[PDB]
Amino acid sequence: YSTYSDLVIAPKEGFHYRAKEIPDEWELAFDVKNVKFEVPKVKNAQSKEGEVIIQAYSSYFKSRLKKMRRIFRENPEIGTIVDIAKLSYVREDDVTIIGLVNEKRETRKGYLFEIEDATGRIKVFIGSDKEGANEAYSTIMPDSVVAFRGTPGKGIFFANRVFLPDVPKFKRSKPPLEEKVYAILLSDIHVGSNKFCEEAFIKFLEWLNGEVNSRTEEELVSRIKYIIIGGDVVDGVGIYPGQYNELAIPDIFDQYEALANLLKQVPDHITMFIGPGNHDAARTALPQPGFYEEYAKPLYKLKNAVIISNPAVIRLHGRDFLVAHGRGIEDVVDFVPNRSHHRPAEAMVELLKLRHIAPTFGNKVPIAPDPEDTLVIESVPDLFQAGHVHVMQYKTYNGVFVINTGTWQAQTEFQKMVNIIPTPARVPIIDVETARLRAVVRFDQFCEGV
Amino acid sequence: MPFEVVFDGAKEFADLIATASNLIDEAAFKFTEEGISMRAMDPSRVVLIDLNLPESIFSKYEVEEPETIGINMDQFKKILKRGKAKDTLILRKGDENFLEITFEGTAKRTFRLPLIDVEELELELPELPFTAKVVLLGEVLKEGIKDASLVSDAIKFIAKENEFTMKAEGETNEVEIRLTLEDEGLLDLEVEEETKSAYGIRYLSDMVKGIGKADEVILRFGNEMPLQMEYMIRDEGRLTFLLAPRVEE
Amino acid sequence: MPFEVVFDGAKEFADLIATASNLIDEAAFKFTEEGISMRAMDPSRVVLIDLNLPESIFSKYEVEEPETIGINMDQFKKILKRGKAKDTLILRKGDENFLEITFEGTAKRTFRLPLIDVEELELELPELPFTAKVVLLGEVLKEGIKDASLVSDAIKFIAKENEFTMKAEGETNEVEIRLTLEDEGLLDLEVEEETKSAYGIRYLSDMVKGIGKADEVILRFGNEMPLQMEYMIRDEGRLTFLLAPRVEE
Amino acid sequence: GDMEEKVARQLALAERIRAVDEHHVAETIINSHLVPDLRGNLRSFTRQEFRCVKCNTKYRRPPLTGKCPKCGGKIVLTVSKGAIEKYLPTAKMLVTKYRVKDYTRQRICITEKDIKTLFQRTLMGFSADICEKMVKERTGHS
DNA sequence: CGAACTGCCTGGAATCCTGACGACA
DNA sequence: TGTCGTCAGGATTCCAGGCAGTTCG
Ligand SMILES: [Fe+3]
Ligand SMILES: [Zn+2]
Ligand SMILES: [Zn+2]
């Protein structure tokens, strides 16, 4: 097997590089935020052999209640916010209650909900022919934070109005930048398997140097100063027993070193962003601080290679760029009807209007309990990144830019046995100033036909 | 390979086997013409054991060819459990891979145990200055560690010019053990510069459980340097321990 | 209020710590310029402990203002569990509600514990008729309460002009501890008229558990009156107990 | 055969190690048991089954509720962190007793995952730690 | 000649080790 | 219903207490 350490091509001299000031500043850093004095200090008062799981997962929802509750307080629309335990004092007046969604019960009379807060639990009944019945029905059923306006009854809270953590439609626009800059969003590379679209990848690397086919690509590529990788750089180890006969590179150091030789072709003026994943030799539990210190030694050696956290909010030119991968899309298309993998953006709208990444538990990804919920989108996100479905779609929701990143491997038998058609060689060229999709690059000609 | 060695006393060596068994679980005492040594680490990565016992400690010392054998700490620990120091410890190994432990005391007890094939990787230890070497007794370490380990789990070692202190903090229970040269528990100080470091007292508990009362204990460590603690046996033998510092809070 | 207390012989005081913490887990120290007293009550309302320590017990004893402090003896037991006798125990309090225990001697060990409030029922020591006074020892009490425990769960106190016996029987086994002047168990006695009462065993077994064997104990009781178990410490201090009588026998 | 057949694997495997002349090649015999431990720890990891003391057959939802609404008992969770830690040193000592490739990622990924989940900088790799020793080989070679 | 110095034997306090009882899915 | 956590009883060691061998007041 090869090691990908031979592809060394210098950039084309005919391609003009623009020398300009490149600001860079990350906002969500797991080192200074959580693990500084909150993650190592959870309880410190227990037996000789105690657990730190009851408190982390206990406060994990309390932090979400404080953050999302603060978001509801920032919105000048929700009013009369009370606790569930305070509903016994109010006789008939309608109030707002904020709580978790335990389950969802469907009945001919209407929708019976089980809302539990840190103070109490009550059943929130809402009619079927309601205006907010669609939002409350299509919402995330296992875990969600909701608010209701209504009055309690004989033990069942008869709510009238629904409130979800949706982004505000009314938002202040961003000032126009003096210099134009673009960005590329890509993930699901999966280096290490025998079905990798190596051709589209090397033509893509050669395309990054300035070897463009059309004249329009020169103006955009000449101003690209940032590259972002979502995750899933390898095929994974330990998923299915028939993977050893498929992994072309069974050595993990050759995958990290191979990936390092494949990524070193990017010029130095382009800022690199490397985010960890769940298939690589790193922390498979979300959230993910970064890579390990054994296998990521050549990556740490490269100063240009920046190992960002997962998730990470990268603020560029005053823009909040939420970088994450998640698995909420599959939970939506598998749990909410009328949703499929062919339209992943539609599944991403539900995740956008909840300010969370992956609230559904039980899917094929471990969730690590933390005393502070970090997956809550506090500030107004300008970009929402996701994937794991290999279908790229463009959709803007309430001025928020929604797009996918695609993949770089051909369709496998595993992908064939689950009835999902991947879309490899999808390179979306987005704009940083306008925070919208600028161009779409499709190298599907070099890949397999879907 | 066959060799025989007669060491007088059984309890003094049983303290070494007790300290080793409480600090390591699998070790293979390597036998050289200079004496019995063992450079190994606990399989849980907590301490680092280095036993150096010259032939001067042993009464009779007869070697044919230097070789290495493996000894279980548990079984050999149970042998010298009730072994009186007034006996005569005898180690004999012949052609076969058996160990003969003859006791010539109030009752001759010729013993036999198999010797397993330990695959211990002989690893050495590098050399570098620590700038903090102290000479303290053993009992002061006993009462100083067994009392602070109940209020906290990590202890902080700080040594200055003619000053020694070991303070440990916690939620609502602080402690410190300050000693100087004019005290009665600190023998000597070779501190040259300011030294401060943090370690885990939970390792120091079992690490010092096997120490004596009048045994001179020498500690060598640094700021970011690991912890070293060595002490002599019958004024000639040397037992050195080295543990990595705590990278946590 | 800041104050300085210095007491020698922490080993003798540890028995008082075990005796005091064996019943109640927390203690309320009445810190007075004339001395340190302590009135703590059992939660089951069975015994009242009062420690009286004058100023003359403490060599170095500085009082700024008398007050009441709260000591969690559950950890103070661990403080004085390894305390020696030839050392010097020091209890100093500063401005904050913390207690700093300077332990000087062969090694310097200072402690820092919080001072929390102690909830105890206000029960004084009324001037009650005590017509039975006997002087016992620790071993006499240990063997008496334990041997009386192996036979029953209660005890019957019968004291006459020149005798002090304890008869107790559950159903079959009978115990009768007789004290005379020919032996050494009974040194002094003050019983004017014959007196009888009844008390428990488990509580007396819990109070004698901290008290040693060579410790003379003064016992007082009257006809169906509460028991007053007091004894001097260094011939000046006085520890007084209060037991509740039992209706059974 | 957790008693006789397990020791039989521990002895016959060592006999195979003596037979291959310290030349170990990657295999799946114990890995045949290590894969269910990996998918069981990762699977039950995100489950966190809450069972109160009084009620046993009454399982609580994966979200946190604070206390059991039915019974006044604390809820006990099963994240499979303390039950699988017993079978790990069984094969971990054997894997640690040899330097082999293509398997270090599976061995160290789970224990480092437990470390990252729960949370002693070792002076050096003397516990047979192929991490520092190996990366040092590659770094010094570059 | 007889007790202190020196050295040594034995019980008591602190410590360590082991068997039995109560709880959980 | 097996297994893990925890408490009380027995065994252990150093120190105090008590007992041999010798010499000068
Ligand atoms: Fe992918
Ligand atoms: Zn993915
Ligand atoms: Zn319950």
Numbering used by the authors:
A (entry chain A): 286 to 735
B (entry chain E), C (entry chain C): 1 to 249
D (entry chain B): 1080 to 1198, 1206 to 1228
Q: Can you quote the paper on this entry?
A:
PolD is the archaea-specific DNA polymerase that functions as the replicase in most of the organisms in Archaea except for Crenarchaeota. The PolD holoenzyme consists of two subunits, DP1 and DP2, which contain the catalytic sites of the 3′–5′ exonuclease and the 5′–3′ DNA polymerase, respectively. PCNA is the sliding clamp that enables high processivity of DNA polymerases and thus is an essential factor for replication. We obtained two structures, Form A and Form B, for the PolD-PCNA-DNA complex.
The DNA in Form B was bound to DP2 in a substantially different manner from that in Form A, and the orientation of the DNA bound to DP2 differs by 40° between the two forms. This swing motion appears to pull the growing end of the DNA out of the polymerase active site. Moreover, the nascent chain in Form B is unwound by five bases from the 3′-terminus. These results suggest that Form B corresponds to a state distinct from the synthesis mode and thus an editing mode. On the other hand, the DNA orientation is toward DP1, and the 3′-terminus of the DNA can reach the active center of the exonuclease in Form B, although the 3′-terminus was not observed in the EM structure. In the Form B complex, another contact was observed between PCNA and the central domain of DP2, due to the tilt of PolD. Intriguingly, the third glutamate, E171 of the PCNA trimer, not used in Form A, was involved in this PolD-PCNA contact. In contrast, PolD is substantially tilted on the PCNA in the Form B complex, and one of the three PCNA subunits is available to accept other factors. Therefore, exposure of one of the PCNA subunits in Form B appears advantageous for recruitment of additional PCNA-binding proteins to perform functions different from DNA synthesis.
